[PDB]
């Protein structure tokens, strides 16, 4: 993810 997204 660009940054915090789906794991």
């Amino acid at each position: 993810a660009v940054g915090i997204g789906a794991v």
Partner: antibody
Amino acid sequence: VQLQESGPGLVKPSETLSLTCGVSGGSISDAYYWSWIRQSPGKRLEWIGYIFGSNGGTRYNPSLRSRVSISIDTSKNQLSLKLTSVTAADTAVYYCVREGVPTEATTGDHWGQGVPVTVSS
Amino acid sequence: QFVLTQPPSMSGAPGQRVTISCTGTNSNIGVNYVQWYQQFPGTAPKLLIYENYKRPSGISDRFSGSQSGSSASLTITGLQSEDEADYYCQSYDISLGAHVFGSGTELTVLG
């Protein structure tokens, strides 16, 4: 694609902190992870949880899962955070973040400016 | 309780090549992506690296990111005073079911 936070600068202990994030330049329904991030004094950063724009399914940091709720208002293009039973441990700066587009030339994340919430009697 | 720890402070001269390390456990860096965030005085964190090494557009090419096993690293080649900021690695912790941030490293540029 910008974001901004509204909310009471002060909240009383055991009461419920409520925050709003307004989004401009992009839709809140989009298939994105909208996270609430808090930064305590001492500059420690904590991820509270996120909500996915399309389904509205949410996932919370288990350390706070009971006290938290994150939701979406499609008509206002809005994101909302509620944290109950707050103590001095929740005085912090609060941001809303969207992960941002997954493309070769992305600008990256999108962060609000952050609203400082102080918990005090 | 920090599952991602970084040296609290790091110092380097202009032009020098410096690196900020991030030490994690098997359940976050060992198996998950790491992001690197930069934060200036009074500023929201600025995403610098995602998926261990990818730079978003606009990020200077002097920044590079690596990851192996359960450790990650951020490298500034050609240190600039413009780079004086706080740096955080960030990953996902499976054991704790939550996204986590490092202790942060305050980078100061001498000269």
